[PDB]
Design a protein around this ligand. Structure first.
Ligand SMILES: [Ca+2]
Length: 223
């Protein structure tokens, strides 16, 4: 997260870190057994780390649970990033309390102008590289479809939305991938892609979670 703020420990209780020897992506806990992330975050041997603030220090609220199975969206295209969503099942159910909690799925899509919270452990610099140990947060609005398409001609599908600031300086970034965009207590987006980070006229692009609720529910019901 570039141009954000330190969230505070366990203030984003649905945020998870996906670990394969190291943090590599975010995700969102949506029930005791399941995490939503980006399909571009797929790999084998994932450990889901819940209850994290400092990802390099054991601070007392962590639950580390291996994934039993990952399900990339059936129509994910890794070239275009269309349908950039994946479900991850935990081998055992997480213990839920106020520091580790699920986030609700949307029942309606969010509109441009809605304010959201984007979070993660990704790079905090728009030029060069600095990875934080503690969770970072950014409040940002959803942008209009027309501004999003104008920013990224030929690239924005009906399964994507832009959020952030056209002036630059405030965005998600590498290592935030897969993490949440939460608006009015609902998971509306997944950190997906963008041109660099925090660049002028190049806002963040997010997977439009409301399009996937049917798939998520039916997949959980049978897996
Ligand atoms: Ca920790």
């Amino acid at each position: 997260i570039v141009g954000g703020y330190t969230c505070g420990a366990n203030t984003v209780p649905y945020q998870v870190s996906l670990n394969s020897g190291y943090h590599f992506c975010g995700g969102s806990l949506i029930n005791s057994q399941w995490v939503v992330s980006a399909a571009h975050c797929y790999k084998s041997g994932i450990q889901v780390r819940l209850g994290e603030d400092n990802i390099n220090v054991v601070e007392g609220n962590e639950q580390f649970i291996s994934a039993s199975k990952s399900i990339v969206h059936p129509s994910y295209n890794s070239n275009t990033l269309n349908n950039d969503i994946m479900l991850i099942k935990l081998k055992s159910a997480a213990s839920l309390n106020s520091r580790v909690a699920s986030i609700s799925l949307p029942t309606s899509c969010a509109s441009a102008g809605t304010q959201c919270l984007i979070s993660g452990w990704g790079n905090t610099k728009s030029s060069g590289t600095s990875y934080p140990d503690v969770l970072k947060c950014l409040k940002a609005p959803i942008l209009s479809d027309s501004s999003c398409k104008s920013a990224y001609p030929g690239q924005i599908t009906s399964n994507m939305f832009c959020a952030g600031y056209l002036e630059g300086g405030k965005d998600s970034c590498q290592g935030d991938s897969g993490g949440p965009v939460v608006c009015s207590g609902k998971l509306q987006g997944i950190v997906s892609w963008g041109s660099g980070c925090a660049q002028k006229n190049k806002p963040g692009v997010y997977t439009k979670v409301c399009n996937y609720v049917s798939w998520i529910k039916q997949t959980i019901a049978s897996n």
